[PDB]
């Protein structure tokens, strides 16, 4: 259990900068965040 | 009005031009020379009215092979357009709406009464016929 599951998040670095998302899966640093407009889920490190 | 049983006893002209007695692009009409004279009793209002709703959408159906007309009559009911103008207040199981419907550039006169110009179900695309890269075979 991480305190960041099912919470609104924003991406600050990389090719998806400034996109609003929701954290769905968080095992080891590679948070899985669904994107509000593109109907897809992408992996991303917690640093971003 | 005449039904199928009364049609067996009448003589119908196809067009009003048929009531009065060498181009390589114009279609050729029957001579009907077996009889010396003809006494028509009725005349068709327009020959294109023998088609239904789905076949009235086809442009130039008399230049097509008939199975392709049947295939288009089947497929035209699966095209995506605007089924009703109140789709926002309706709650249907499924519904598809096209962003930018366009009316066709080639239309038939029967499309006037089918409201196809007001609720069209397609778009005019610029089409080339070419073997470009082998990805359209």
């Amino acid at each position: 259990r991480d305190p960041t599951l099912n919470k609104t998040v924003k991406i600050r670095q990389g090719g998806y900068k400034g996109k609003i998302g929701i954290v769905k899966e968080a095992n080891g640093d590679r948070f899985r965040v669904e994107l509000h407009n593109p109907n897809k889920t992408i992996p991303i490190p917690c640093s971003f | 009005y005449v039904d199928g049983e009364e049609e067996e006893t009448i003589m119908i002209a196809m067009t009003p031009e048929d009531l009065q007695t060498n181009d390589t692009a114009k279609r050729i009409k029957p001579e009907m020379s077996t009889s010396s004279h003809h006494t028509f009793t009725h005349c068709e209002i327009h020959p294109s009215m023998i088609l239904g709703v789905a076949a009235s959408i086809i442009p130039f159906p008399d230049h097509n092979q008939s199975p392709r007309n049947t295939y288009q009559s089947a497929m035209g009911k699966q095209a995506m357009g605007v089924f009703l103008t109140n789709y926002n207040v309706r709650m249907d199981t499924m519904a598809n709406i096209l962003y930018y419907p366009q009316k066709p550039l080639a239309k038939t006169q029967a499309m006037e009464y089918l409201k196809f110009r007001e609720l069209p179900a397609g778009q005019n695309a610029i089409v080339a016929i070419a073997c470009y890269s082998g990805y359209n075979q």
Partner: protein
């Protein structure tokens, strides 16, 4: 719709007849089992009351 069914199917009820002129569409018909049994009214057709 013509209720003849699937059993004992024959070409003759499914055929486009001469008397169909001006009353049912010669083109619109479903593909497959209901070919020729399901018909569609022509544009100027009517049904007696």
């Amino acid at each position: 719709n013509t209720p003849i069914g699937r059993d004992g199917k024959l070409a003759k009820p499914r055929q486009l007849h001469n008397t169909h002129w001006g009353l049912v569409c010669p083109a619109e018909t479903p593909e497959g089992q209901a070919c020729g049994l399901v018909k569609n009214l022509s544009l100027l057709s009517g049904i007696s009351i």
